[PDB]
Amino acid sequence: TPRRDAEYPPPELLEALKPLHDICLGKTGVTEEAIKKFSDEEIHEDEKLKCYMNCLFHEAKVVDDNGDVHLEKLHDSLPSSMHDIAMHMGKRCLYPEGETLCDKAFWLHKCWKQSDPKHYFLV
Template identity: 25%
Template sequence: MNTTTKVMLAFFIYTVVAYMDPKDFGDKLTKLGNECHDICTDVTGATEEMIIQVRNGNFIDDEKMKRYVLCLCRVSRLMDKDLKIDMVALNEVLPAGSRKNVPSGARDCLVNARNSDLKEKYDKVYEMEKCLYNLNPDEFIMF
């Protein structure tokens, strides 16, 4: 499997988290999500109110919220500093059979955000989340 294929597959797996039913997360993913949530709210200052707004599709233009989303990706070790998905970390936490929930176009969300003219990584990751939300708002989940 070449590097491009691995990166695409890893991103495919990563985006599953945004479209899974929380009851299907399993112990590892639930624990990781809760830990990252607690760390990232403390580090960034994002509030529960802000997070709920984004969960509901209101992507507020707030640097704390943008940094929170990037923090989730980085603290979970699911994404590295170059905004590349870590396939090994994903495979450790994702429940088996969860890949079927990813909508088509999810890979484009990461590629477009990563290649955008936005300067800050938190802006790029936030754009990726907006894109993922827009692919399937009814199934979008964020910690």
């Protein structure tokens, strides 16, 4: 079951993600419910959600010159409290597959959620 309490997900990270959520939901058209369901419930297929995921990586400045996720930039952008969790969650998710940047972004989130459903979250 996903860990959801006063300390996790890190409140400061959730707060920082709010304006990125607004920008990305406005650009991609994903619904609030699709995001919450992927975060807390089952992995599901939603093309706008995949693009929302890609958009968050771009808005968080954790992508390379072609828009692909740079995993070191991503790790560095996270609070230290989740560095360990992130490393294990991603150690078998190093090389995304997918045609589009949205497909690859979804590949990452699915791989992370499959690896550690307790700590995975999406906002």
